[PDB]
Ligand binder design. Structure first.
Ligand SMILES: Nc1ncnc2c1ncn2[C@@H]1O[C@H](COP(=O)(O)OP(=O)(O)OP(=O)(O)O)[C@@H](O)[C@H]1O
Ligand SMILES: [Mg+2]
Ligand SMILES: [Mg+2]
Lengths: 338, 20
């Protein structure tokens, strides 16, 4: 009942911001651009320093014309409208947003510990208690997002950042959507797509729980449950749904993953009468103190190295590119509400 | 080993989204 009432208050908070979104709350000239932290299919994210406060932030830059070509206009409006409205300990905070003639800009808190992705590839795999610590945070974050009628749709290590205390921050709300019924857009990342997305069925928040199953498998194995050299091959494996587990996977871990990586929607954990509690009460999570995790009272498995305020040593290096702002406004109508 | 097959595959680097 306490979770229920917590989520009720959170929804009140969310809806006020959802209906009256923050807009135009800084300007590009207020930030010193330092270094690129990462790129994705759509945007480039740079470390910046706010001149007036000396705070460091991570600034996502989207080229409006590219957003249009890739048919991501409504998605990008979703992304900013949702991210500015949410508030949870494992969701990256949006501090400012604004636009100019050429680009859209989302200025977030800078999460300095790097992508989960880079640590996972370098170390090889996480032990089960390590993976469980991260998994617990995703479970609570999805409980929160889904209670707001939000579907996230891009869970993967590349979109999960480690903070200074070793906790997860979820970034990249590019495919997040507020929807009460089914939805139909083919989006996500190939290794993480639920079968019903691949098969062009309408789908719902159960796809996020499937993706949690992929993430837990990849964390604990060091490779995804379905991989190949090309996406088409990956899709064939996903739809067959046959999963093989490393021999070091515990009995409890295999059982959880069989229930998350479940092609039958009437059987998939997260999607049953008991909702998220089928997951929270599973044997693999028996040692998890869900409230202590929410309160960030649990000692983390590891703490990223941190040499200073603006240090970027936990991120790969990227080729830097000039931020050019055209003297003519591009796509003004399309992004009027941003 | 499956690990060795993964490491020799073309998709061990950062994976971007799909669309359309
Ligand atoms: N708040 C942040 N702090 C530090 N680094 C970040 C932050 N947000 C994003 N990044 C880095 O920038 C990268 C790309 O950001 P993001 O995933 O939002 O862009 P994208 O174009 O939407 O990616 P995708 O192809 O996954 O849709 C991340 O993978 C991460 O390396
Ligand atoms: Mg991303
Ligand atoms: Mg994205």
């Amino acid at each position: 009942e306490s979770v229920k009432e917590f989520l009720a208050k959170a929804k009140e908070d969310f809806l006020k911001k959802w209906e009256s979104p923050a807009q135009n709350t800084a300007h590009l000239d207020q930030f010193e651009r330092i270094k690129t932290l990462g790129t994705g299919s759509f945007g480039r994210v740079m470390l910046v320093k706010h001149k007036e406060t000396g705070n460091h932030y991570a600034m996502k830059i989207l080229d409006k014309q590219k957003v249009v070509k890739l048919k991501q206009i409504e998605h990008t409006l979703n992304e900013k409208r949702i991210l500015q409205a949410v508030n949870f300990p494992f969701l990256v905070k949006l501090e400012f947003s604004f636009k100019d003639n050429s680009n859209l800009y989302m200025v977030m808190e800078y999460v300095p510990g790097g992508e989960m992705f880079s640590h996972l590839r370098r170390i090889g795999r996480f032990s089960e208690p390590h993976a469980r610590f991260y998994a617990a945070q995703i479970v609570l974050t999805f409980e929160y997002l889904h209670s707001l009628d939000l579907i996230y749709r891009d869970l993967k290590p590349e979109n999960l950042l480690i903070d200074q205390q070793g906790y997860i921050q979820v970034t990249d709300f590019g495919f997040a959507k507020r929807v009460k019924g089914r939805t139909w857009t083919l989006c996500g990342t190939p290794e993480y797509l639920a079968p019903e997305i691949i098969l062009s069925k309408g789908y719902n928040k159960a796809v996020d729980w499937w993706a949690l199953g992929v993430l837990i498998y990849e964390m604990a194995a060091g490779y995804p449950p379905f991989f190949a050299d090309q996406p088409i091959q990956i899709y064939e494996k996903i739809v067959s749904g046959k999963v093989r587990f490393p021999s070091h996977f515990s009995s409890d871990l295999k059982d959880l993953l069989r229930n998350l990586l479940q092609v039958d929607l009437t059987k998939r954990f997260g999607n049953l009468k008991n909702g998220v509690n089928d997951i929270k009460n599973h044997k693999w999570f028996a040692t998890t103190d869900w409230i202590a995790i929410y309160q960030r009272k649990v000692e983390a498995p590891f703490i990223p190295k941190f040499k200073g305020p603006g240090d970027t040593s936990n991120f790969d290096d990227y080729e830097e590119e000039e931020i050019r702002v055209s003297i003519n406004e591009k796509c003004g109508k399309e992004f009027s509400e941003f | 080993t499956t690990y060795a097959d993964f490491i020799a595959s073309g998709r061990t680097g950062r994976r971007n989204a799909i669309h359309d």
